[PDB]
């Protein structure tokens, strides 16, 4: 025959390989295809879709619907900071069980801009402005509205349009940031403040709600699979 | 090929175009770039979305069961395997396929078969190398009932014979289903009366894999174990679904126990 | 303006003056089965304007402690019109839809809903050894309703929103076709579903193509002295219905 | 033999593939298809919404 | 290639053509389509009759016997195999070839040889790997009578030597017969007097396969077993026959015991 | 080398086969021949029977 | 020689395979074919033939 | 290709050109040939600088750790390996890579796995051949905590299965780093406060390699050992450094102990 | 298959070899290169640089 | 296939290399690149110094 030798690694089974292997039913006639709507070809066709973010996850709100909405209300001072959380999807408690956190927890690298789209669920006679903000790491979270507006920020004005998109930029000293929490490659902070106040007539409620959505932009990508750590078992289900 | 969109420069603006405002009172999600909320610069961006395809996502082998069987009946292991095919035993491979409603794919089944000697009172034990048979009975065939019977003649059934020490045996299984895709969630019932089995287990009917030691039993006896591994190929997955939030309970049901949306925080404002 | 729409199917019409677009689910507009994707070798009846037309399901009261509702289709149209008389004389059927949820409220009311069409929504069960009885999935024209907190029954469906009765995060129901009825903008939502199944046609009674779900994401709230009952009415019109494989009456 | 480009990294690069089996389900997996179409989960609306215009006129 | 006929549309008819009526008083079976008894629609039909060929039907390997032989004579196993070739030992491979009166084909014989140690009083037992010889004696040759004699020199006889742990050994046997096809049913007798052996066993005369352990006996001794597998190839099968209804009795006869046509029903009308 | 089409499924697809042996009984089995002729077990009659006509005039 | 490696499944015997294997009688002259009537080429040339159906299968 | 410069002839000179004098008060080192201080002759010189490339210098495999693990827990060896990847364990491979500040390369990891039986009181010991699993967990994944748990399902983790007696298993690891090159010396701190870990260990975060015996434990038990070997390929090394003069102390620090520049001499003038 | 034989030295691991071996992350997108100053391509770009010589190495 | 010259020694000599994998990190190491540029560790000065002239004028 042809004189050949076997290089190292040749009776191995590598799970990430692709090799050809003989069919177990020769000349099998597969069922025809049909166009079933909504073919997925990439998982940046699921990670670019809005998903409600539980920004009011405390400890008694976790099994209710109260998780997904943070109460914003008329104040008699100026009002402080509505909410704020460290950005770092797939390792931040806030963002890791959404669709940009359970599709990033099959990866260990991520990059590109994402965007948060807020929506106001108040009355149609209520109005107010809010200063949305993002501060790159290296100073901790802003502790006043004065420091919060030095970062990138978008003043949202509640009008007929009910939603406004703070599109966080990329900004990193690496082309990819780890999905997992790592102090090397911290991803900054999101914070939201009252620009003005919620002002509402007498005969409407003084409490409204803001909800947050999260989706990736069209410059977003991930690399390198790993199994998710949000699922576990002790034994086979049977 | 596939690559990410470039960031494009813009100067300051002060116009009556509002990209930032949107209404999410529609299914239409905002399409804003980071080039619409601050100035940015031109960045030619070379990142590829090449590992986030559905034929890189699903196309790595994953264990789906192990069955144990013995050459002397160690402790209720019988002398042959048996296991009705499904993907629902595990929580790994299962979760990734319950992130799509329908998938058509061509598997590669790879078996990894290992053995260990039993505790026994036999002495001067030397066994020749084992040969294992793995037979696939498509549904409605005859089923073995003992280590040796006529069913293991494999007169038309697919079967693999493999001897220990060689590379793991593998084969490809073409897309075989009644449907035009495998169904991962069925909302119907088996009957037209809305009675009997409910859920995806109604449609599941993929036959059974048996295995045994070809060799006649030696005095000491062994316990072998077979681990089946499925690797999708040529995958087209239709209709996406939110991934599971809850631990599974059963392999024929979706029953779940109510669980927290997310882990705790101290307060709304946390650094 | 872009707030005004009219939809005419059959002899029915429905109009809106606060509306946010139409969401065509998965970007496929419903249409008749082709001859390259057929599989049944007999002439399909296509009633056309006798079955494609808006049908109105029972209205549900949106309370301030409501946790949501769901209607499984096409088991909510089993009693409606001549649509429901062509599921009982045919072994097969397919049909898109154009679910239109509507719920007006004043400008001093506030609240938010998520109207979402979930293909193949398979519901859990309170007991993990059982699969839910028929009466606990479907109510016909009457919605079955979610509960705020986890329930314990036996054959009862596990209804807690935070899991959506499926064991998936409730905020993640958004890849599914959806619109939000928020009471300071629109007051209607229109989702045109195509026929989504893995086989070209399937028996209407046995199998439920999708499940509409309406889930309050911000509670209804108003200053007292205002209207205290605001209903949510769901109309849905079959689109391009065709049935095939005629046989005797029933579904036994 | 089919000669195809490898996965190359950014700033020879060919590989040869021959199919040896009579079934097309025995071929090695595709991993070179990077086609997408986000706009049907992302923008499923009937009437086009232009980014620069308000959504609700 | 081969594909099923398409269904063709027709409208209602009310003509003096009767496709439906026929007379089965002739060998001619009705040729009616379902397009002749109801309207139907045009269905372009892509199904293939590709697994119902006679070279997909018969072209899967199937066991045809096992012979046991020993290196110490375990219990009447001798030290060599012996087995006069026929396809009639089994009921699997046999049935599929008794569904045709004549078949010409080129076999592939694959042997699967395994061993197990005997119960013995020998201690400190270590055996080197076994080598097995499988010799084919075409009819009228000399036959071995012991483990070692001159017949196993294989001076012109085909023979396979194989050492355990390697892949199963196989070979091809060309179409070898006096006839222009193998005969699966012979209605004649051996003699011209209509005496002696009757049936297909008269024509059967395909030689004998012997096998032995090449190695000289070790102290513990082993019992090996060989399973022969035939896979037809290049098959042309002439004259079909109704498949068997009855269990076989003997491998040289068709003798049968009278058996029921079909399983019971309660009545003429059953749901 | 002989290059032949694989079994493809409905809605590359070639394979190469080289014969290495000197006997034609060592070649791999045919499985690509799907030829038929039903009409000699199905319509063995001497005189053609047309479907639309009655069988017995 | 040519440096090659052995992929998974390579000492297996699969019953549904078809591979070439060396002849056990080299240069064997097979008997000529003749046209024996009624060659079967497919089993839809046996399954398209009428067969009496036992529609009165009771128990006696 | 690369070859040394030729020596070129010159006659005597007595000119006002001084090649020999220079000022090393600049970074510019003298460029004098031996053709500038004495006459020389034309020597066509064929020597090649072909083994002094950085892809011949660094491109030989070198051990980087061994981990031991046991099938019965011999003496604090556990039943699985674990080892956080770095190149700093050894003083061989480490020294050659601390002769450059930055290197980008594509490794080849080759594992050489061997085993030996333990001292044990077990008798009549026969073990089938071992199969070993080597799993690579990229950082932030789930980590095994026992010999059998869900983490070894390798649902997306790279993993090698190998059976003893076969050739050493190897694979290639592409250039994987956050940076545009690996960093061999970092002068920063992890924090922005100049607190916490200091040095190159701040940036090091390359995941962890675990390994175990696939086989269930036999009565005697074994102790296996795995030796990892890295071979750079496609190497571009930027910014050279003086090689180490001092023995290393730690694998996360450069701490060193003050050591002599050179070995002794008797005096300034030594023959 | 193709009849081949294995020449001496064929399950060996030689440290100075170079052979191809399958990637452990298929389709991995390596980080772009940049021009970091002072690329070394040969070690006669380090050995042709002046280095102070300890010509008064005694013992103290 | 790429055909390249072997390392030959001074006073046939070809080898064929085919890449079998889809990644370019699986290719065998380069060892045929002997490119150099000493003058940036050896002569890093801003203004050229000519050998025959005194360094410091």
Residue numbers in the entry:
A (entry chain C): 1 to 238
B (entry chain A), E (entry chain A), H (entry chain A): 2 to 272
C (entry chain B): 10 to 261
D (entry chain D), F (entry chain D), J (entry chain D): 2 to 12, 23 to 68
G (entry chain C), I (entry chain C): 1 to 60
Question: What does the publication say?
Answer:
The protomers assemble to form the ∼30 nm wide icosahedral shell with a pseudo T = 3 arrangement that encapsidates the linear single-stranded RNA genome. The arrangement occurs because of the similar structures of VP1, VP2, and VP3, which all adopt an eight-stranded, antiparallel β-barrel fold despite having low sequence homology. Recently, we discovered a second druggable pocket at a conserved VP1–VP3 interprotomer interface in the viral capsid. Here, in an effort to better understand the druggable features of the interprotomer pocket, we have analyzed high-resolution structures of two medically important enteroviruses, coxsackieviruses B3 and B4, complexed with interprotomer-targeting compounds CP17 and CP48, respectively.
We chose to work with CVB4 because no structure exists for this important human pathogen. The outer surface of the virus particle is similar to that of other enteroviral capsids, with major features including the fivefold star-shaped mesas, threefold propeller-like protrusions, and twofold depressions. The control structure of CVB4 incubated without compound revealed no additional density inside the pocket. We did not detect a conformational change induced by the presence of CP48 (RMSD for native versus CP48-bound virus: 0.45 Å). First, in CP48–CVB4, density corresponding to the native pocket factor within the β-barrel of VP1 appears to be altered by the presence of drug; however, there were no major conformational changes in the four capsid proteins based on comparison to the control structure of CVB4 alone. Another difference between CVB4 and CVB3 occurs in the exposed loop linking β-strands B and C of VP1, which for CVB4 differs in length and conformation. We were unable to perform similar experiments with CVB4 here because there is no infectious clone available.
